[PDB]
A paper describes a structure:
Full-length drHerA without any ligand was crystallized in space group P3121 and the apo structure was solved at 3.0 Å resolution by single-wavelength anomalous diffraction (SAD) phasing using selenomethionine-substituted protein crystals and then refined with the native data. The refined drHerA apo structure contains one hexamer (six protomers) in the asymmetric unit. Not as apo ssoHerA that predominantly exists as a heptamer in solution, drHerA in both nucleotide-free and ADP-binding modes have been crystallized as sixfold symmetrical rings. The shape of the nucleotide-free drHerA hexamer is quite similar to the drHerA-ADP complex, except that the central pore formed by the six subunits is highly symmetric, with a ~28.2 Å inside diameter of the putative DNA translocation motifs, ~24.5 Å inside diameter of the putative DNA entrance, and ~28.5 Å inside diameter of the putative DNA exit. A pore with an approximately 24.5 Å diameter was formed by the helix-bundle domains, which is enough for the entry of the B-form dsDNA. The drHerA apo structure and the predicted drNurA structure were further organized and fitted into the low-resolution cryo-EM map of the drHerA-drNurA complex by Chimera. However, drHerA spontaneously forms a stable hexamer in the absence of DNA or other cofactors. The innate stability of drHerA suggests that drHerA binds the broken DNA spontaneously by threading from the broken end so that the drHerA hexameric ring does not have to be disrupted first.
The nuclease NurA and the ATPase/translocase HerA play a vital role in repair of double-strand breaks (DSB) during the homologous recombination in archaea. HerA is a circular ATP-dependent bipolar translocase and helicase; it belongs to the HerA/FtsK bacterial translocases family, an offshoot of the RecA family. Each drHerA protomer comprises three domains: the N-terminal HerA-ATP synthase barrel domain (HAS-barrel domain) that forms the putative exit for the substrate, the RecA-like ATPase domain, and the helix-bundle domain which is inserted into the RecA-like ATPase domain and forms the putative entrance for the substrate. Herein, we characterized, for the first time, the crystal structures of D. radiodurans HerA (drHerA), with and without ADP binding, and a low-resolution cryo-EM structure of the drNurA-HerA complex.
Residue numbers in the entry:
A (entry chain B): 13 to 197, 206 to 270, 273 to 603
B (entry chain A): 13 to 197, 206 to 603
């Protein structure tokens, strides 16, 4: 149990000190070490630290050109192997230096738990990954579910850092470790995740045949005792209760999902015109936050009109029936127009709904429009609102249907909170950016409203990638607003964000600032020194530039510095090729 | 009883110097030391200081590889134990360098008083915690009650830093030390605290069932002569006079009023607001708490608040509801089948939705959509809808809190008054309520207390204990709740309103609120935040230490003493959880 001796040739301070590695021992860059010293009074003090600097030097060589002779042993010299320890905790809080010559050892048992502040975690610790030699890393669940800490934020080079895989692992850990019941001691968990990568998120229902092979290879290499999942205490199995939703293909009443390689088990999801109006979906059409005009007054006004109009609807249908649409000279044709038994037009398509908005705002009274709808708003602002609806109508029109019947509508409505479902996967990769931002906006706002009305209830995890897309640093959008609501109010409300981006400096400062858990994959060279990565010490930056895929640094409030960690291969399928018959 | 001698190998200056720790003594990083030197004419000069750096080195080892041999005794080397002193005080204020070889000693009873400027705190000193595993650290109450100082601002990582516990400890110390009596020689103490945690602050009048074992364990470990509370001189009992207020459960359609508390069903009083009082006390501005990014609704809110205030004054009845005679529903979708009508044909608004409906009618339906001209003072239609839409959006959340249905006697009993006679501590339960209701309740109570002090004068010291200060007083937003916090910060000293506020980072809080705190306490700080400009009052030496501070461990900084002082405080004598209750 001897790894080295505290060095006296370098200063020995309570925060930082060096030690010499014993012969036959190897000290890695991230190794967690404990050294115990004796006070003059005789009472002991334990120092728990992490190695941030490791070096090897030749102590007696006068010139670098004598190195060939020195290695041979012809010239007298001694190789010196030393490490620097960054103090994280002192069991007795005495800020006195350890004596040179004190024994340094790897934290392995109770010492390792003390170093990672597992005593503060208590029953709330659950596996956040693997340490150097198969020891699990305790993650304090109370800082994920909102008791004392907020959400999770993952950063790293997209394509190189494995951000989404680590998120899915954390969901697996949270769902299968039992910490939800332990911290509850309402005690359950749900997750909503969006497939935008192809069909990668679409087979996490099935076991991954390649997991065993790849697992055993790594197991034999690093010499772990059992399978990496077994070391964390987690079953190597897929997600138990999974729902796959997809958009409704492409003037046919029949509906079947846009998915190609996975066709079995996938359910189409659609919105109705009536629900569109009733549930104030209109703002989530305007996802261009990068820079724009102030349509807030127009959107709010038309939104309220549509809501009141939807509430007045007595019919059972899914479309919206309006009685004040006349076509003295509207390009729109009276044919193909569902007409009510009361002479009202029943809007069955999104393009018809925009046509009616054009009429109320721009054609109604020889061009000045219906004053109840245009509330003194300028013609230029109205037509901006109109033209943007026209621009996205083709892309949103298949997702919003009024021609569907009530049977189909109740069946196909996307509910991330459906009973008996733990993981909802919404397949948006076939949709355009406008349909993506629309669907994400509506669904997130639906979950937020529901938790506002009822309460914390079940803790709902939202796993979102490309955070810079949805919540830019400088823009302002509705979809960014619901993510702000989730970040700032989600702890108490029970909506927890597991978000990832290539760089946190491109994400809204209030989303990133509210993540209790920060996880860093391989970081770009320039990004590591940015202000948003101050929680990584300078020691880590050079290492972080070359971190291998699968390797993350996790930082959480309980323990002061980031800890490097690895995590197993997915027990679930992430592409079509990994599914047995 | 000397701990070392001034070192000549490092420069000796009046402000900063090194000393060598003598054999058999241990010198900690935050230890208070005193050194005495002698002028050539024989007069003595005393240096009171704090250690900020401490180190150990091998003096004679020529190669690092030797260490193993050197430890065995085969090679000669000596361990060099040295500490650096940051001078806080010079008692004869002669800025001369101490002479090398002078004797360094731990600060003694009287020497400790001089080092912590206790002489400046004649009798206003009260216990602020335990320092250096030793003696109580004196806190100047005159910098907390506003005679010479403002309020307290506590900062640290929520969850690990023990921020709220240190605030409650300070309250206990102020209220039991008798320092209120001493500083008097209109000299009484009151405290308002909001429970935003899950019923954590609802058991402050119950004794801590595990505070004896936990304190005892600490006493055994550090060999203290007596208990930590005993060492401070403060009794180890809970808050004596406590008021617990909670919102009403099943508020909509239920006349019976019952509090929303689940864990504690005894001694908790339900608190409700009344529609006439809402109009009379101009509480409308507090409904608009979303200052993150907002429209210029200031004129509409001001316009309606005055109209509502005048309407309340016009009421002739003693009834809680508001009576309006100018509301009609020709085409407005507000059925009157369930409504209360006055003797003179007026309508009595008993529900929050009804008040908003009346406002919607005056603003948007009164004259074929034009609206009553007196009510909308040439405000754009979009601006009126934004004001109306926000009220409808928040109506379900504030409806249980604002009731016009109750009788005057019922309302008088239920109104939440922090200044109620015979009450020293008031706890308002806000955990059940939504963020909008929470923001509305804090602003109304703070403004009512602040306004009452302005008319009456400062007859009592009201301590307002508020966590998550970034939420209520953001750095760049502008809100009514921020404005009442600003009034408390900038005018509370003379007015007697003292803010004990806590945030995870002062960087997220309004510069004026943090700048007006005379006392600054720091728990374990985030790695990034120590480098920031809001934490310049920590010397650079402290930063690396502050990154790893344990729960229970705080650095307190006050104007009388130049550098921060590391402190510990006892475990709470009051219950902070349902299981910590002692029967």
């Amino acid at each position: 149990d001897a790894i080295g001796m505290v060095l006296g040739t370098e200063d020995v301070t309570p925060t930082v000190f060096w030690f010499a590695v014993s012969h036959g021992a190897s000290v890695g860059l991230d190794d967690l070490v404990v050294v115990e010293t004796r006070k003059p009074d005789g009472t002991p003090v334990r120092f728990y630290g992490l190695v941030d600097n490791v070096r090897k030097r030749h102590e007696g060589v006068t010139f670098e050109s004598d190195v060939e002779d020195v290695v041979a042993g012809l010239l007298p010299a001694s190789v010196s192997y030393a490490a620097r320890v960054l103090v994280t905790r002192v069991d007795p809080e005495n800020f006195i230096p350890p004596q040179p010559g004190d024994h340094v050892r790897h934290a392995a048992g109770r010492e390792l738990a003390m170093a990672l502040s597992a005593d503060k975690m208590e029953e709330a610790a659950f596996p956040g990954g693997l340490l150097a030699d198969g020891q699990p890393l305790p993650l304090n669940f109370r800082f994920i579910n909102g008791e004392s800490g907020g959400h999770i934020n993952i950063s790293g080079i997209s394509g190189v850092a494995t951000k989404t895989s680590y998120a899915l692992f954390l969901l697996h850990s949270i769902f299968r470790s039992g910490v939800m019941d332990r911290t509850a001691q309402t005690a359950g968990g749900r997750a909503l995740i969006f497939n935008v990568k192809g069909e990668d998120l679409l087979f996490l229902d099935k076991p991954n045949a390649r997991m065993v092979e790849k697992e055993d290879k790594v197991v034999r290499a690093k010499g772990l005792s059992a399978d990496r999942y077994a070391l964390l205490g987690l079953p190597a199995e897929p997600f138990r209760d999974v729902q796959l939703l997809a958009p409704p293909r492409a003037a046919g009443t029949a509906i079947v999902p846009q998915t190609d390689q996975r066709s079995e088990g996938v359910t189409p999801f659609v919105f109705t015109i009536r629900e569109f109006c009733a549930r104030r979906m209109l703002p989530y059409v305007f996802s261009d936050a990068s820079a724009s005009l102030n349509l807030g007054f127009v959107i709010g006004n038309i939104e309220e009109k549509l809501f009141r109009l939807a509430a007045a609807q007595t019919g059972k249908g899914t479309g919206l029936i309006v009685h004040d649409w006349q076509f003295e000279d509207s390009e729109t044709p009276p044919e193909n127009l569902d007409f009510s038994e009361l002479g009202g037009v029943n809007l069955q398509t999104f393009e018809q709904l925009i046509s009616y908005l054009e009429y109320k705002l721009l054609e109604e009274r020889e061009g000045e429009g219906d004053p109840k709808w245009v509330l003194k708003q300028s013609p230029g602002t109205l037509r901006a609102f109109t033209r943007r609806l026209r621009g996205v109508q083709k892309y949103l029109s298949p997702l919003i249907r009024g021609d569907l019947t009530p049977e189909q509508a109740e069946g196909y409505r996307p509910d991330p909170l459906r009973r008996g479902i733990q993981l909802t996967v919404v397949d948006i990769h076939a949709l355009s950016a406008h349909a993506q931002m629309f669907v994400v906006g509506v669904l997130l706002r639906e979950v937020f409203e529901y938790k506002e009305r009822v309460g914390r209830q079940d803790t709902v995890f939202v796993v979102l990638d490309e955070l810079n897309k949805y919540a830019p640093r400088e823009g302002d959008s509705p979809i960014k607003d619901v993510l702000l609501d989730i970040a700032e109010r989600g702890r108490s409300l029970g909506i927890i964000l597991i978000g990832a981006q290539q760089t946190a400096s491109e994400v809204e400062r209030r989303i990133v600032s509210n993540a209790a858990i920060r996880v860093v994959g391989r970081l770009d060279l320039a990004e590591a020194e940015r202000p948003e990565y101050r929680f990584l010490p300078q020691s880590f930056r050079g290492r972080a530039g070359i971190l291998q895929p699968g390797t993350m640094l996790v930082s959480q409030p309980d323990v002061p510095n980031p800890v490097l960690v690895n995590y197993p291969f997915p027990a679930w399928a992430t592409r079509r090729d990994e599914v047995d018959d």
